[PDB]
Amino acid sequence: RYEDAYQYQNIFGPLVKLEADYDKKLKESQTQDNITVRWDLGKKRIAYFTLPKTDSDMRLMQGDEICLRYWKGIGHVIKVPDNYGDEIAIELRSSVGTHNFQVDFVWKSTSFDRMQSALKTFAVDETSVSGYIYHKLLGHEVEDVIIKCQLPKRFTAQGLPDLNHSQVYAVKTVLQRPLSLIQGPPGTGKTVTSATIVYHLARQGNGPVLVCAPSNIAVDQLTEKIHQTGLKVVRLCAKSREAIDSPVSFLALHNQIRNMDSMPELQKLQQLKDESSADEKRYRALKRTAERELLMNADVICCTCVGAGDPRLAKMQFRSILIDESTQATEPECMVPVVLGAKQLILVGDHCQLGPVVMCKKAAKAGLSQSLFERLVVLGIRPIRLQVQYRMHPALSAFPSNIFYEGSLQNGVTAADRVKKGFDFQWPQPDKPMFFYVTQGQEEIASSGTSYLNRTEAANVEKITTKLLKAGAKPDQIGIITPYEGQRSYLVQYMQFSGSLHTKLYQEVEIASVDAFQGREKDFIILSCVRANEHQGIGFLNDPRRLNVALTRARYGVIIVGNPKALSKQPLWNHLLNYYKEQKVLVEGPLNNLRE
């Protein structure tokens, strides 16, 4: 609603300063006083130590820096808890210059420093955004601007699915306006549409197109679709994130640079570091020339929002910018890319899906909690909704459509098309591939830490896992969601033991929070709500958005396991339970029936 660029930086700036102070202090408060360690290896050394199972909102992910006290040595996170033996290892960069230590979580200001310098440029730099973007971002009243361009004859792109009418219209409209919003409800084909938009923006031959999303998962998913059109795609990664796998690692800058057959000397110097002084002077220099060569030549650059603040992008201007999953980001974050020269900006997302995590309630309250997306809807830009969904069986989409998309969501797959070829699993109701299983297990504190678990519910999950596999379900196609790290640990260990089938087969099923499932689909989803308490919840327990994602990840079937009584007290969780009972599904003790 603002009036000036300085009046803009004026408000957000002091209020990014709250996140930065809060989390820097919060960070220093998660120091572990005396965990046990062991000197291992893997030379890129690594292994290992175990840490109190404790869930959060910003959890430790690979891309975090750590320190070891009790001699003083730093290093970065190599191993993070997941269904292959939850423990933590870190690569010391000083090859140890035994065995009761102290662990610190190093605080990095980069995310915030960049957000800070973004706002500054929005103030100091006249060439940071187009006049029209400049005025509209500050909420000024401006006459609409038409973007000149040649509309393609086919709106579909090369190596991508064809578009329905809502997608076509999104593409067609987006390409002709300087600022656009596209709301993309679950499985409505957001990233296809976005990739289709990017393809067209790239065919305009007109520098690299910039493409971002607040999370790495989100970028990767979109990097994968854009690549499918054949465009030259460079995917920028946090220098910190370089050792991580993805379906698109080969597209990543650091890798493309490693495969530079045209640069001897750098190729040489690279082998040596695989093991200095004056060599460090020239390795950095050639690496920089390598980076700029690929970045300059890309059709498309894909990174995080904070990602776009990277020094390596210095002094590059991006005229077309598409940010997907914008709804998931704070304004200052989402703004980091924008200030790199935007003249055409496309924000994609859904405020009914994952929202921005703010740690400092105070900053949250006083204005850090709102998307750029949301703030613009408020300012009156009408998002284009993607109308059809292709992921789930109608009954599975019914409840989410009704709560979030005012029951308007079309179904692109008929009930016929969502019966699994070879499934031997008749459901409590012959029509609806869903149910709620009732469990009154005992709530308990973590075996080591402060998160929570539930033994009975967990027991119940594994049998539902087993039953499903036996009907013909593939392990890679089954998910299990739980709000607690507690229940996550316990699921991992337990799954293989009381599991009748082969031990690796369960070990092939993914147990994660909601964040790990963002934008991903599976054939079956199991929820573990794990509450027998009425005590305030954290996951999809007390967040509609978070819950929406959970209910909209499966193609063929969704099974919810929880205490209907201990969750009823929450305006959305009861609408859920009520709707289920009416749909003649809410059950007890397998080979079962209805419940009260």
Give the list of residues 6+ apart from residue 137 with CB closer than 8 angstroms, or none.
8, 129, 338
What would the DSSP string read from start to end of 506-525? HTTSEEE-SGGGTT--EEEE
Say if residues 345 and 178 touch (Cβ distance below 8 Å): yes
Same domain, 479 and 554: yes
Sheet strands (E) in 350-423: 384-385, 388-389, 410-411
Phi, psi (rounded to 5 degrees) for 369 = -80, -10
Residue type, 255: N
Same domain, 125 and 238: yes
Whether the link from the prior residue into 134 is cis, omega within 30° of 0, is no
What would the DSSP string read from start to end of 542-586? S-HHHHHHHHTSEEEEEEEEE-HHHH-SSHHHHHHHHHHHHTT--
CA distance 125 to 131: 12
Same domain, 303 and 383: yes
Residue 421 has which token pair?
Answer: 């070829």
Domains in the chain, number:
4
* Strand pairing class (209-213; 452-454): unpaired
Same domain, 432 and 569: yes
Same domain, 304 and 337: yes
Cβ burial 432-469 (10 Å sphere, 16+ → b, else e): bbbbbbbbebebeebeeeebbbbebbbebbbebbbebb
Say if residues 561 and 461 touch (Cβ distance below 8 Å): yes
Q: Within its chain, how far is the Cα of 338 from the centroid? A: 20
Phi, psi (rounded to 5 degrees) for 561 = -120, 120
Say if residues 445 and 475 touch (Cβ distance below 8 Å): no
Say if residues 214 and 328 touch (Cβ distance below 8 Å): yes
- Owner of token pair 């409505």: 188
Say if residues 54 and 450 touch (Cβ distance below 8 Å): yes
SS (H, E, C) 154-177: CCCCCCCCCCCHHHHHHHHHHCCC
Q: Which long-range contacts (CB under 8 A, 24 or more apart) does 573-576 make?
A: 573/541, 573/547, 575/403, 576/399, 576/547
Q: Within its chain, how far is the Cα of 577 from the centroid? A: 28
Find the distance separating the first CA and the last CA of the chain, reported in whole Å. Answer: 50
CA distance 38 to 50: 10
- Please count the other Cβ atoms lying within 10 Å of the Cβ belonging to residue 363: 22
Residue 570 sits in a domain whose CATH number is 3.40.50.300
CA distance 453 to 291: 47
**Residue 322: in which H helix or E strand, if any?**
strand 320-323
Residue 162 has which token pair?
Answer: 């064809």
Give the list of residues 6+ apart from residue 285 with CB closer than 8 angstroms, or none.
none
Q: Within its chain, how far is the Cα of 101 from the centroid? A: 33
Residue 459 has which token pair?
Answer: 């027991």
- Residue 557 pairs in a beta bridge with 524
Same domain, 94 and 114: no
Same domain, 583 and 533: yes
CA distance 298 to 312: 14
Same domain, 309 and 323: yes
CA distances from 340 to 129, 224, 273, 318, 354 (A): 7, 24, 34, 6, 25
- Please count the other Cβ atoms lying within 10 Å of the Cβ belonging to residue 96: 10
Residue 267 sits in a domain whose CATH number is 6.10.140.1240
* Strand pairing class (384-385; 344-349): unpaired
Residue 200 has which token pair?
Answer: 């067209």
CA distance 383 to 356: 19
Say if residues 118 and 13 touch (Cβ distance below 8 Å): no
CA distances from 560 to 107, 181, 364, 413 (A): 38, 33, 31, 23
58: helix, coil or strand?
A: coil
Listed residue (469, 522, 536, 527) closest to 499, CA to CA: 469
Give the residue from 86, 106, 126 where a domain finishes. Answer: 106
Phi, psi (rounded to 5 degrees) for 402 = -65, -40
Say if residues 253 and 294 touch (Cβ distance below 8 Å): yes
CA distance 129 to 321: 11
Listed residue (517, 505, 427) closest to 473, CA to CA: 505
CA distance 39 to 46: 9
State the Cα torsion 29-35-40-42 to the nearest 10°.
-40
Listed residue (191, 192, 232) closest to 215, CA to CA: 191
Residue type, 338: V
Cβ burial 556-591 (10 Å sphere, 16+ → b, else e): bbbbbbbbbebbeebebbeebbebbeebebbbeeee
Annotated binding site: 167, 187-191, 353, 390, 521
Listed residue (166, 136, 180) closest to 387, CA to CA: 166
Same domain, 139 and 16: yes
Same domain, 243 and 269: no
Q: Indicate the length of the chain as a whole number.
A: 596
CA distance 115 to 237: 18
- Owner of token pair 């539930």: 454
Same domain, 82 and 135: no
User: How was this structure obtained?
Assistant: X-ray
Same domain, 475 and 568: yes
562: helix, coil or strand?
A: strand
- Domain boundaries, position 288: 248-297
CA distance 527 to 361: 28
* Strand pairing class (478-481; 522-528): parallel
CA distance 129 to 144: 16
Give the residue from 64, 79, 106 where a domain finishes. Answer: 106
Listed residue (342, 376, 345, 371) closest to 357, CA to CA: 371
CA distance 593 to 583: 13
Annotated binding site for ATP: 167, 187-191, 353, 390, 521
Listed residue (305, 269, 272) closest to 289, CA to CA: 269
- Owner of token pair 């009520």: 578
CA distance 231 to 321: 16
Residue 43 sits in a domain whose CATH number is 2.40.30.230
CA distance 382 to 180: 8
Residue type, 47: A
Give the residue from 77, 106, 135 where a domain finishes. Answer: 106
